[PDB]
Design a protein around this ligand. Sequence first.
Ligand SMILES: *[C@@H]1O[C@H](CO)[C@@H](O[C@@H]2O[C@H](CO)[C@@H](O[C@@H]3O[C@H](CO)[C@@H](O)[C@H](O)[C@@H]3O)[C@H](O)[C@H]2NC(C)=O)[C@H](O)[C@H]1NC(C)=O
Ligand SMILES: *[C@@H]1O[C@H](CO)[C@@H](O[C@@H]2O[C@H](CO)[C@@H](O[C@@H]3O[C@H](CO)[C@@H](O)[C@H](O)[C@@H]3O)[C@H](O)[C@H]2NC(C)=O)[C@H](O)[C@H]1NC(C)=O
Ligand SMILES: *[C@@H]1O[C@H](CO)[C@@H](O[C@@H]2O[C@H](CO)[C@@H](O[C@@H]3O[C@H](CO)[C@@H](O)[C@H](O)[C@@H]3O)[C@H](O)[C@H]2NC(C)=O)[C@H](O)[C@H]1NC(C)=O
Ligand SMILES: *[C@@H]1O[C@H](CO)[C@@H](O[C@@H]2O[C@H](CO)[C@@H](O)[C@H](O)[C@H]2NC(C)=O)[C@H](O)[C@H]1NC(C)=O
Ligand SMILES: *[C@@H]1O[C@H](CO)[C@@H](O[C@@H]2O[C@H](CO)[C@@H](O)[C@H](O)[C@H]2NC(C)=O)[C@H](O)[C@H]1NC(C)=O
Ligand SMILES: *[C@@H]1O[C@H](CO)[C@@H](O[C@@H]2O[C@H](CO)[C@@H](O)[C@H](O)[C@H]2NC(C)=O)[C@H](O)[C@H]1NC(C)=O
Ligand SMILES: *[C@@H]1O[C@H](CO)[C@@H](O[C@@H]2O[C@H](CO)[C@@H](O)[C@H](O)[C@H]2NC(C)=O)[C@H](O)[C@H]1NC(C)=O
Ligand code: NAG
Ligand code: NAG
Ligand code: NAG
Lengths: 595, 585, 591
Amino acid sequence: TEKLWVTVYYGVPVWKEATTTLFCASDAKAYDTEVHNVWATHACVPTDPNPQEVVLENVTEHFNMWKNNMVEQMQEDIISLWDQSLKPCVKLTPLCVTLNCKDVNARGEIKNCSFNITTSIRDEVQKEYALFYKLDVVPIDNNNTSYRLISCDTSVITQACPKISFEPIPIHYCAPAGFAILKCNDKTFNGKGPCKNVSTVQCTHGIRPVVSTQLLLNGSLAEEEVVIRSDNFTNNAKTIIVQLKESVEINCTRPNNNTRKSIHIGPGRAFYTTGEIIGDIRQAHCNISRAKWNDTLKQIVIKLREQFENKTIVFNHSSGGDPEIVMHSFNCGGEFFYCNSTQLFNSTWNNNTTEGNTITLPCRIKQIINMWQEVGKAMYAPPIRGQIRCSSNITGLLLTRDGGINENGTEIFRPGGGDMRDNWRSELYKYKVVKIEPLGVAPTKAKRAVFLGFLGAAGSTMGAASMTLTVQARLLLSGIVQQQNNLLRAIEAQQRMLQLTVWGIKQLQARVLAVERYLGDQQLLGIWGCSGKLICTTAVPWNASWSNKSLDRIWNNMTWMEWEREIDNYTSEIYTLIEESQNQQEKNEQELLEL
Amino acid sequence: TEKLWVTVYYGVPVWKEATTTLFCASDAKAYDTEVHNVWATHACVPTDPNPQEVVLENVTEHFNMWKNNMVEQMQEDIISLWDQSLKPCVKLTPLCVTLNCKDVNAERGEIKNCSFNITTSIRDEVQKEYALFYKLDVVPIDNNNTSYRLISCDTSVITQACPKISFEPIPIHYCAPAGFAILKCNDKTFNGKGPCKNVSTVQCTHGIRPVVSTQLLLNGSLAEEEVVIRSDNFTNNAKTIIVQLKESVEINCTRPNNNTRKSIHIGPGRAFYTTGEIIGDIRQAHCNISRAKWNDTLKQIVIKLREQFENKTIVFNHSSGGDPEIVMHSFNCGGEFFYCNSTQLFNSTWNNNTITLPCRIKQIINMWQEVGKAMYAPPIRGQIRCSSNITGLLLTRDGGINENGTEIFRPGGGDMRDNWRSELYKYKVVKIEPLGVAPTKAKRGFLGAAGSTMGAASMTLTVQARLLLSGIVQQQNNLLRAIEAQQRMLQLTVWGIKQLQARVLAVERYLGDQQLLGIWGCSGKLICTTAVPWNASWSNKSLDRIWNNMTWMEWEREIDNYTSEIYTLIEESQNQQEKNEQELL
Amino acid sequence: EKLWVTVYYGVPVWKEATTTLFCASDAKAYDTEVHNVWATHACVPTDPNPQEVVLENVTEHFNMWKNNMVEQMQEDIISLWDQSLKPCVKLTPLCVTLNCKDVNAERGEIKNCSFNITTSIRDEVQKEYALFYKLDVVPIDNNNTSYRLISCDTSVITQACPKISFEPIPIHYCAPAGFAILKCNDKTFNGKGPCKNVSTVQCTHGIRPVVSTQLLLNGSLAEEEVVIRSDNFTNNAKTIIVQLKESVEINCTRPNNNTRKSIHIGPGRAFYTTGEIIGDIRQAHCNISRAKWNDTLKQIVIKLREQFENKTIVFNHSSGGDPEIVMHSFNCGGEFFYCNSTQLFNSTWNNNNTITLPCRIKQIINMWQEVGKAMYAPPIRGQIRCSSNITGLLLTRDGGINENGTEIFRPGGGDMRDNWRSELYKYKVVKIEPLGVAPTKAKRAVFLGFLGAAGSTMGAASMTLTVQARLLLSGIVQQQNNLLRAIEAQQRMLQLTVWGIKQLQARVLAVERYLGDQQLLGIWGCSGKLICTTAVPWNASWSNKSLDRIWNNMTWMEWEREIDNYTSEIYTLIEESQNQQEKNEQELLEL
Ligand SMILES: *[C@@H]1O[C@H](CO)[C@@H](O[C@@H]2O[C@H](CO)[C@@H](O[C@@H]3O[C@H](CO)[C@@H](O)[C@H](O)[C@@H]3O)[C@H](O)[C@H]2NC(C)=O)[C@H](O)[C@H]1NC(C)=O
Ligand SMILES: *[C@@H]1O[C@H](CO)[C@@H](O[C@@H]2O[C@H](CO)[C@@H](O[C@@H]3O[C@H](CO)[C@@H](O)[C@H](O)[C@@H]3O)[C@H](O)[C@H]2NC(C)=O)[C@H](O)[C@H]1NC(C)=O
Ligand SMILES: *[C@@H]1O[C@H](CO)[C@@H](O[C@@H]2O[C@H](CO)[C@@H](O[C@@H]3O[C@H](CO)[C@@H](O)[C@H](O)[C@@H]3O)[C@H](O)[C@H]2NC(C)=O)[C@H](O)[C@H]1NC(C)=O
Ligand SMILES: *[C@@H]1O[C@H](CO)[C@@H](O[C@@H]2O[C@H](CO)[C@@H](O)[C@H](O)[C@H]2NC(C)=O)[C@H](O)[C@H]1NC(C)=O
Ligand SMILES: *[C@@H]1O[C@H](CO)[C@@H](O[C@@H]2O[C@H](CO)[C@@H](O)[C@H](O)[C@H]2NC(C)=O)[C@H](O)[C@H]1NC(C)=O
Ligand SMILES: *[C@@H]1O[C@H](CO)[C@@H](O[C@@H]2O[C@H](CO)[C@@H](O)[C@H](O)[C@H]2NC(C)=O)[C@H](O)[C@H]1NC(C)=O
Ligand SMILES: *[C@@H]1O[C@H](CO)[C@@H](O[C@@H]2O[C@H](CO)[C@@H](O)[C@H](O)[C@H]2NC(C)=O)[C@H](O)[C@H]1NC(C)=O
Ligand SMILES: *[C@@H]1O[C@H](CO)[C@@H](O)[C@H](O)[C@H]1NC(C)=O
Ligand SMILES: *[C@@H]1O[C@H](CO)[C@@H](O)[C@H](O)[C@H]1NC(C)=O
Ligand SMILES: *[C@@H]1O[C@H](CO)[C@@H](O)[C@H](O)[C@H]1NC(C)=O
């Protein structure tokens, strides 16, 4: 009552949005390993499966799609994970020399090359027999036969180590302690904004690291019907994403059986190019029936008619520039296929207001692959002693708006390509992470049979949120190491090269940042003069300068998220005045305990 | 009362496995201002203060000590040490060079003068030098081409050894962090997977010197009095067979070769030490050893071998051909690479006087496993005169057809992981779980780990639990010079890194224990008693047998192996009640 | 009686120890996008308002030649320059001979030089004109057309990293926990002996990296009586350090409008040099105010003849030796400066306007320490001015025997270490650890005034003043810059930087002290308050101290330090006897 002796609270189920370093999870990568060269590309600790997942149904929150910081780290992580890969790999340094080449017909784009190379200490190789594609050389000296080397002006002599494999792994992702990822269990709800049905998630689903253009290889389904996600404010001038309800696999073909042919170059230097092919090569294709795709295009216009009153729907092909963006990068088999999709949008959509049931697409894989965000450091891959038929279900799409005005109601959808980020935004569009301040403080009250939610206490009955505070901490910050409890030193602590990892050093950074909160909290608990108690009734009465509500209403329906920001005017204010009076207690009995 | 009233027993002596990298320790008299120059370890920077241990014998358990987790750390660790020293070393540019070799004054297969042709690094002068090199470490083609190519130049790079650093194996006491026990067994005769009556826990190992083996165990510790194999191996003939040894054997092996050094510059900061001229004699490295003792050992061997083979007829045959280094014995004293042809040592047959061994040396060493890493031997002047202790062997069931006496051993050189497995079979690393609650029927300095009911022996391990981070007690790491030796040179990040990684594990394990202390409102006092009823759904047994007939180990094994929810269930019983005494007081 | 022991946790125990150095940036006033590796692109911002407490009653010797923190910090800048050069490129193909011409006249100073090369892999040859000095080119074959770089024949050579600069940011060296920094506010303190007027500060003041040789600029002015420092005045082979209360500015600038040429080496390498010249060039001359330079030399021989009277001191130059030593090395904003000190020491000064400095510029910079590596300096476009105050000098004493008895002095220099010794005369960091016991005959305000308070008193205020010290032990935002938790969210960066290594260094050891403190709180005293932690057993037969409470009324904590030589084991004997009570209180609760 009016005694108003304000009382601290430890472990209050509250949260603040914060951005801190992530954490990974690899039960499945720890479940099997043929060779650790993918683990060299993708190293992570297991996570003890069947994790706990809890629903918080009574509190909506504003989800901010397109603008979460969790996008930013995971993209810059993987580039660094691409950096560790290329550190031991050799640099193809003398290679921007001239080329004499003659074209080979089986098509018409495959060309062998032999030239006066000085590759080793000795052995001037001139019978060099090196087969290349049209797309992997720059045509120079067109009357002569020079015709070579796309990007050797810049630092592109990096190449792939042949023993290293590239097959992506579904990787779950967790958080360091004191942080919890929020998962909206509403269904495909918007492209930006809040949602009611939500939940906490400790560790997300698995994500294969996959990058493709205008196209969603091995993606994630939509349990609803087809949905769209946009920003819808600069909608006229911004590429947005498309999510598909069902999926279609596409089996994509084999050129022919192939040969590796190590060429003597130097110290660790022996790369590969094809000198032999078993038989006569067939044109690479990705095989699919039109009719299922014919079904999908109608489903698009349904979403288009939801946005547009009655606009015409047109599909031209995108412009000539950015050829990797124009085509479709299929990186399956560790091999970077590109396929012409001009056989896809011959049809523009008829406003309604089997001739070719199936379709295969013309394809050319490239042998040299460039870093996209800057100029320099292209990645070279060696050929395979084989021919690969990969297949992947396709679950989404990326398209441009193509903004303008031409015939007043007719707008075109040329296809839309992007960066690696927007590939990775899409699956993460149901996940946001917050931090935990377990401490709270509210004035006193009158008088001095289930598992519960982590945030359902803040979800509903914030007055009756007075219980279960401890177990809300025992998974989230407490148990500093909740990932593989006992802190399993495992196939990450086992068999790690150099002991200088992106993960473990950050993991070293992780657990230290865990405790200095908790200890520094408990420092502050000692500064508050009490530890080991959830509450501590303290010796200032609540001055009503801060608020004017009644006692019962606060223990009625007042959300913690409400109640924290009402008292955010007096954050350090309500801190300092009681601890100094607690320090005034400290100057009372200390002089008394001298005698 | 008859109800289960549970109450915390902190510090109950229970162990359970955990894989964890651990501490090391070395003598303070060993370093001699050359922590780096002795070997890559910086002579194991944390000191070895005291061996003060106790031995802990109540009962035996089969800790199946054959399969072992410690080794995999250590064999990873050693490779981390060898690239560590070799990283500031410099590469070799003249890799695949012709180098027409000639020998001085005809013994054959030796060092060849190879007339080193080179143009230097960035300058433009075709020079000629004196390349004095073995037949072994180099390869020509076609017997008319003097294309003496380097044996690994097509494979990978090669680098000089930074020759200030020597190659001495240091007796190192591999210790452990907090909450960790190193199991050992003073009972004799246990072969890998075994139990052990005379059993004990230590905090540090003895001063192990892990160095080099092809098939023989060198400078290793002795066995029991009976020369008996103490490993577990399946009866498949492809399973490798180690054996220990009682009688230490000592062999004189030396160089009749008094070479000089020569430095050859190529590039900036790149002068290359090579073999100079040899003073005086040029004879082959050999190994004097008494075969009568080898006769005396071999008789003592086969009797135990006939005992484990139901009186089979064992005949030793010389091993098959193959790799140069698996077959011929790369044994390395003085940091040089003796290869010894053991064709004198298995012309031997069984049914019911100073042998001298001709040897030879190659320079260039690869990893057997990762094909990208090669190491070059620096020339050292003088003549190497050193020996060894010999206390173990490794062979294999060969596997011929049964028209023989049904046992042939043709020896085999193997993987390195074997060589740490060779001694740690009597070792095991376990983790300690001072947590524990038993139902206690009440409505709210001898030895560390033994007994069935702890009168106060749990408190003894709390003293070990308060060896956590005292900063002053010499037993843990003393954290006084150990706290200062790391902070000076932590930039090395090879050896002190795991130490500070051990600090990481040291705190948060303890801190989570410090949490779960304060989580249940226990706040020390070792008891933390609660008036919470618990049903006999878990146990309808006499409480008295639970006290004394059984310990708390097997009681934890029996019913507690699953009741991990009781932690949460005693949490909420606290959590509700603490709110109740908050709400009522 | 008296129980002969009580625990008394918080007691100020100053104690010499060497821990890892800690520091923070003050780029908060700068916020430069340019990294400037010394600036660390703002490691961590500093405290605006620290507090400083002077302890008057303490005297203590502080050797200013046995500091660890100098060479540690000297090691740091060496390691700092490692993370500078290791990103950018080395001049590996550029180590070849070259034919060179003089542009005009001066008189052979500036050298336009030419060479056939293919820094490209695309297999061409052409002559590459480039503009140089006489100062960096070795002549070959009777000084004919053959020329090379002086360096690169031994060391390895890199290009300096173009996007950053070479400006020192004053920074506050500091301490996380336990240990702290000391200052002595008295004067004429050569670095030996004790001193009074002693303070302690948590951090340091803003300290800029001093790098120049034979010259001391932008540093400690210390405006009291002119003092001089050296190690051992018996030995002539000791460095003689000058402090001056006055600050002579010296303006020095580029006498040349110049441009940049960027020679494309190859893929992302792209060497930078000077493009051209606008007009003619001079030798970057400088002004000293010779009359003040007349004045300064009058001031210094006073204290010199105060130390050694009737010694007719004459100035001499150094012999022809090492160019780092014999010349004034100098940096200000980029390039390097080498001015002749010959025009100083024609003066003698035995008994009683403007100036010119011909100056030189070395492009290549070899390894100061031993041999290993070398650095190339690319030029900067346009003219650059620099005027800077001079605070001090380094000198030496010759050793040849005079029958005139003259003390001949010549320029002393050639150690990057002593630039750090130049500032750290006042500064010492000792461990402070809160533990200390006392047999007390009990019934059985100044802020951070630790040693001003006495072990004689050990007063009730001395108790609460260590309560202030355990207020220092806990860290949150703005009590602690590492536990400034706003920067902790900002610190998403990699910690592979040496400074980031210092972060993960200093934080955990601060914790495990505070843990190891908190580990020993309960097991020793079983109390939160430091006094009521008491022990019964009468250490008389083995503490063995012929004293009393009335002796303790006039004592000190160094007595307790002398007690530690005798009783260090007795704490463990106390602690097992401390264990004796709760093992008998256990059987009260056991049965
Ligand atoms: C997709 O839509 C775009 C425009 O909405 C079409 O681009 C148009 O292509 C035609 C054919 O080349 C262009 O016609 C020519 O234009 C030039 C320059 O204006 C003119 O001099 C010629 O006489 C001829 O008319 C037209 O300009 C161009 N429009 C734009 C805006 O670029 C494209 O053809 C459509 N895709 C398909 C498959 O039809
Ligand atoms: C400053 O320091 C220099 C270097 O120590 C002193 O140079 C020395 O000057 C004397 C006086 O001329 C030289 O003596 C000469 O010796 C030759 C050969 O015996 C003789 O032919 C001359 O007549 C004269 O006696 C001495 O060689 C020279 N030494 C060096 C190393 O330069 C100089 O005297 C000092 N001056 C002052 C004012 O301190
Ligand atoms: C530092 O002080 C010196 C003086 O000791 C300054 O040098 C003086 O600079 C002026 C202007 O640059 C010179 O005057 C010029 O003389 C030439 C030749 O007669 C004339 O053609 C010009 O129009 C101008 O009148 C003066 O001769 C020169 N004297 C000396 C002794 O150096 C110097 O500029 C000062 N530097 C700074 C940064 O303050
Ligand atoms: C590419 O061209 C090269 C050279 O024109 C071909 O290499 C020749 O192969 C035949 C047998 O396969 C040899 O007899 C010749 O000696 C080779 N040439 C040289 C210069 O040695 C190569 O077969 C051609 N490959 C393709 C796929 O077109
Ligand atoms: C709200 O999210 C919850 C999960 O947080 C969803 O709960 C699932 O609901 C279905 C249908 O009742 C059950 O099959 C599942 O077992 C429920 N999961 C759990 C955790 O209980 C619910 O479907 C969501 N609602 C919306 C509209 O998507
Ligand atoms: C006494 O023990 C039994 C057996 O463990 C408990 O039965 C469990 O009760 C929960 C609900 O509280 C059920 O969800 C479980 O399925 C039951 N277990 C089994 C094996 O059927 C019983 O609850 C315990 N009694 C009390 C009062 O806690
Ligand atoms: C050296 O040059 C500096 C740079 O101009 C001179 O400093 C100037 O001094 C005058 C007179 O005191 C002032 O009016 C200017 O404001 C100062 N400007 C700057 C930028 O400092 C300095 O006086 C010169 N000294 C000598 C000895 O030449
Ligand atoms: C609980 O809060 C809601 C939200 O304002 C309100 O509508 C409702 O009336 C409250 N309950 C009572 C009993 O007033
Ligand atoms: C057979 O083994 C027994 C011991 O089991 C031994 O007494 C006897 O000597 C053995 N015979 C052979 C031939 O070794
Ligand atoms: C020393 O301490 C005394 C008090 O004991 C004080 O009066 C005196 O001023 C102090 N002297 C200084 C400043 O060191």
